[PDB]
Design a binder for these strands. Structure first.
Ligand code: MG
Ligand code: MG
Ligand code: MG
Ligand code: MG
Ligand code: MG
Ligand code: MG
Ligand code: MG
Ligand code: MG
Ligand code: MG
Ligand code: MG
Ligand code: MG
Ligand code: MG
Ligand code: MG
Ligand code: MG
Ligand code: MG
Ligand code: MG
Ligand code: MG
Ligand code: MG
Ligand code: MG
Ligand code: MG
Ligand code: MG
Ligand code: MG
Ligand code: MG
Ligand code: MG
Ligand code: MG
Ligand code: MG
Ligand code: MG
Ligand code: MG
Ligand code: MG
Ligand code: MG
Ligand code: MG
Ligand code: MG
Ligand code: MG
Ligand code: MG
Ligand code: MG
Ligand code: MG
Ligand code: MG
Ligand code: MG
Ligand code: MG
Ligand code: MG
Ligand code: MG
Ligand code: MG
Ligand code: MG
Ligand code: MG
Ligand code: MG
Ligand code: MG
Ligand code: MG
Lengths: 123, 129
RNA sequence: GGGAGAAGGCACGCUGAUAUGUAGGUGAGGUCCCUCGCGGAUGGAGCUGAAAUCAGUCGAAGAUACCAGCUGGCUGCAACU
RNA sequence: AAACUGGUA
RNA sequence: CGCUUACCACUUUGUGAUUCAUGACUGGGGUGAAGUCGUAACAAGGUAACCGUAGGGGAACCUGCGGUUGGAUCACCUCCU
RNA sequence: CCCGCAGAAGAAGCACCGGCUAACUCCGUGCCAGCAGCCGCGGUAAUACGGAGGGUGCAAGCGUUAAUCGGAAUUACUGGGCGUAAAGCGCACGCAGGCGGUUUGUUAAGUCAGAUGUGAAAUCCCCGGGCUCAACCUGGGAACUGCAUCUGAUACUGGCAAGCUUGAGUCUCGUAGAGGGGGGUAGAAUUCCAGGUGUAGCGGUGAAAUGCGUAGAGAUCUGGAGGAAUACCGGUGGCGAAGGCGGCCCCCUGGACGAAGACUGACGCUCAGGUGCGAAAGCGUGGGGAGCAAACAGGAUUAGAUACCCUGGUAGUCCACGCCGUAAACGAUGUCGACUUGGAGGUUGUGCCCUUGAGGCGUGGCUUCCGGAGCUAACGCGUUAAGUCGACCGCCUGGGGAGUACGGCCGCAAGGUUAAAACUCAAAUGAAUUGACGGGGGCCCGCACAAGCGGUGGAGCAUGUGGUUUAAUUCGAUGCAACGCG
RNA sequence: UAGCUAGUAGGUGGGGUAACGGCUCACCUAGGCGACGAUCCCUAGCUGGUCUGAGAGGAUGACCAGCCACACUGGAACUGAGACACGGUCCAGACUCCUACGGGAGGCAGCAGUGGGGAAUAUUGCACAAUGGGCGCAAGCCUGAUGCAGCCAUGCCGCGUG
């Protein structure tokens, strides 16, 4: 592009959009867990997974993934969600925060307790 | 149409050096002869000659080392569609001073070294290395 | 081309001044011309005369009586007079 | 002359 | 002081523009193990393919007109000196 | 802040260990449970899931999520690209705008030099000082890249004035050409109509059928009507800005090239918006309609065939006037100008000469092929560049969604032009290498085929296998390469 | 988003302001802005600075400092040197509260603190001892400015857990 052409029309930087739109750039958001799904991953993977359809307090309907082994979320339950997406499951771009609000931590967890929100064995 | 006789001169010099020719044929002009004098003084051409009244003509003689052309690289800088003028404190230096830059100062054309030691900037015509 | 006077708004009487009746129309006398006179030009007395602006003024009401479109939206049928 | 097709990883 | 004129906020009416939501119904798009029908393209893919345009058909597509190669295969011993 | 007593007494956790990336073994599970920033792990021997041991990193913190810059030269001013990966508008003329040959004078706007003023403090940086070190606080300086005024320089760019001819253009004499518009005419052939001779087929396919014909076809001869296109010449030919343009003749008319000679004197290049031209198909009105042929009808093929094939056949193809404005409108390569080794051809001018010749030596325009340096990812381009440069314009920023939706403009309509977002994936793509395959080509071989003999598949029986049944009918082996097999 | 402007652009005279001025009137002319982007629509307090980057650039304006604007919403003016005035006045509006039903009051975007919203953000603290402001001759009074303290690993730095 000639200098004259650039003068007449300058270069416009490429725009970018977040892959986890949760209102105006919030780290976590709380919702009420409308309903609980168990869907199927893509071709290479074959294992059912725990999903929920969450209604943000001041947002929209989103799909979140419940990590760990076992949970206690049924019907209406206030729960926090953070960013992060599951590749296998299409349309899931959020992760439920275990051990926060009504959501409980994972049982008999000894490694990576800070994740999954499991209390250290007091001793 | 023709838009930059200085660029034409530089291109002709580069093409002659690439083709390993003896001298070149050009129409003369004030800038052409002045930059030719700047080159002679620098050691990039054996000699230049001008002849003719109605149609002045300029011929430059090129230099070659044992097996290579002296002019390693030569390019136009202050293009006609985009001109540049530099301060005194900052002036371009080619190959960390090994090369030279032709600058058209108020006191005629000269190399960047001469302009810097004189103490006046101007329009940078080209870099020669 | 229309729809369209779409829809919807403002003003409207009388008196005075601008102007002792204005813009405009008509046009006598006088003068010149003599092309040939039921002639032309110039001239303007007399007559007639809107529209508008400003100010004032009366009434509940000034297109004051008679006369003088109701309007808009969706849809079937036939193009239309 | 005719002469299709080949589960997923 | 009272009265009166000018400016002017709230508020009301009529008719437009623009924008955000929502709406019976409806069109196309995307994803999805392992459904049904065919086999259009990749080899000359078994009618070479594709581009524009027009018509036709469950479907991929077919046919007509023009254009491109981003296409695989040859004057059958005879003739020249 | 200093002093005294006692006592290791009161004080360490978080993440990670498949590669990126520093750090490995066992057990549990068995494509389940689960992990996951990307590639991706897990379907009974998991360094990737869960636990344990061990190890690595950080530490009163550690990790996850959110957001900005960087890496990203991935908007490229510094610092990118458009033959085939995204990307040259179908072509052209041209306003605004950008840029502009050479000789002198002048101006001093751009430009450059010096000075003055200013650019708050804090903050950033350099040298120091004080809190017990640090954070922190603080003295001086530098910086504060800028802006304004004044005084000078005159190489370049700009303005004004005056010149020049090499860019551009006009004039004279000629040449070649399917350049364009209008009118006329000629030969061959197809179809159809009338007539003559003649008689059982014709036609078409791979093979058929439909179809035509004894109401006389086809073939053959004579006469006539009408439409459309110009067979060789014809070519690695020509002309045109592009689309595109072939019988012959006349009228009107555009462009290109060669010879010198004269004339004007920068009058130029490019071009957003704008205007014009623009294959085929298509649309409107009025004509014409021989062949061909969408749609449509019938007959074939096929498992099916509203297709390929065959027999018919309407719009259309043709003409005049309007509209449409799109093509793989391609050299997939924008226009203009300058420079850079060669070879072999074609087409069209022109100069000198022993001119003996269908010859020698030169100089232009256009055009085809091969190739040097160079360039390119490679293929390839290569004086007609995709090589070295300059001026301007157009366009590109992962694949799909999508050249789509909404809005605007244009059109009678079909539609054209300008032109998104949501969402989804980690790829999509270009060139080239090896192999494989091809209802591609060439060559060659084998009881492969062909030429022969004898068999199997038919019947009875022996044996093995599958299936079924049984208490068990033990277990293997399964196209060729299991089935008188272990 | 391609046309927008009638007090609109200019002039004479009067009026008005502390001051020039269509600031405002009467009259006269048809002008003025716009492709170097007017008008219209969306978003936004600006700067010294902060983050990032070798640089050029990109993002940003939390604390501190300078300027601007606002004080329940709309409007107006008085007083004053200075306001069209955060803890002034008047009018109107929405909302809330008291009432003996005749009638009245109110403005935390000042410091604490409460409800609510949110992933999320602290004490209804001490003193005018220092600095700085208002009044006063001074003493002195006032000062949720300011100086301190309380809560939070929110950040940077230092030490210990021998
Ligand atoms: Mg009805
Ligand atoms: Mg009727
Ligand atoms: Mg099938
Ligand atoms: Mg096929
Ligand atoms: Mg095919
Ligand atoms: Mg198209
Ligand atoms: Mg390692
Ligand atoms: Mg195991
Ligand atoms: Mg960058
Ligand atoms: Mg690139
Ligand atoms: Mg082109
Ligand atoms: Mg042009
Ligand atoms: Mg010049
Ligand atoms: Mg100057
Ligand atoms: Mg010290
Ligand atoms: Mg300091
Ligand atoms: Mg400073
Ligand atoms: Mg000059
Ligand atoms: Mg001419
Ligand atoms: Mg254009
Ligand atoms: Mg046509
Ligand atoms: Mg037609
Ligand atoms: Mg017709
Ligand atoms: Mg047919
Ligand atoms: Mg196109
Ligand atoms: Mg073509
Ligand atoms: Mg072509
Ligand atoms: Mg193209
Ligand atoms: Mg080549
Ligand atoms: Mg479109
Ligand atoms: Mg549209
Ligand atoms: Mg043998
Ligand atoms: Mg045999
Ligand atoms: Mg038998
Ligand atoms: Mg066994
Ligand atoms: Mg067995
Ligand atoms: Mg077995
Ligand atoms: Mg005045
Ligand atoms: Mg003013
Ligand atoms: Mg960088
Ligand atoms: Mg800003
Ligand atoms: Mg006052
Ligand atoms: Mg006050
Ligand atoms: Mg208050
Ligand atoms: Mg408060
Ligand atoms: Mg709350
Ligand atoms: Mg520390």
């Amino acid at each position: 592009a000639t200098v004259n052409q650039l003068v007449r029309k300058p270069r416009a930087r490429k725009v970018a959009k977040s892959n986890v739109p949760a209102l105006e750039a919030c780290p976590q958001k709380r919702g009420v867990c409308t309903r609980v799904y168990t869907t199927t991953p893509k071709k290479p993977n074959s294992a059912l997974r725990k999903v929920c359809r969450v209604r943000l307090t001041n947002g929209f309907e989103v799909t979140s993934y419940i990590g760990g082994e076992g949970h206690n979320l049924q019907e209406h339950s206030v729960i926090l969600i953070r960013g992060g997406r599951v590749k296998d499951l299409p349309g899931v771009r959020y992760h439920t925060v275990r051990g926060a609000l009504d959501c409980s931590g994972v049982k008999d967890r000894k490694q990576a307790r800070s994740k999954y929100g499991v209390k250290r064995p007091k001793a | 149409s023709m838009q930059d006789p200085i660029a034409d001169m530089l291109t002709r010099i580069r093409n002659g050096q690439a083709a390993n020719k003896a001298a070149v044929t050009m129409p003369s002009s004030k800038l052409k002869v002045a930059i030719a004098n700047v080159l002679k003084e620098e050691g990039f051409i054996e000699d230049f000659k001008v002849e003719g009244d109605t149609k002045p003509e300029l011929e430059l003689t090129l230099k070659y080392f044992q097996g290579k052309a002296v002019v390693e690289s030569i390019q136009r800088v202050s293009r006609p569609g985009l001109r540049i003028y530099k301060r005194k404190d900052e002036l371009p230096k080619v190959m960390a001073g090994l090369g030279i830059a032709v600058v058209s100062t108020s006191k005629g054309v000269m190399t960047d070294r001469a302009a810097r030691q004189a103490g006046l900037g101007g329009e940078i015509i080209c870099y020669v290395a």
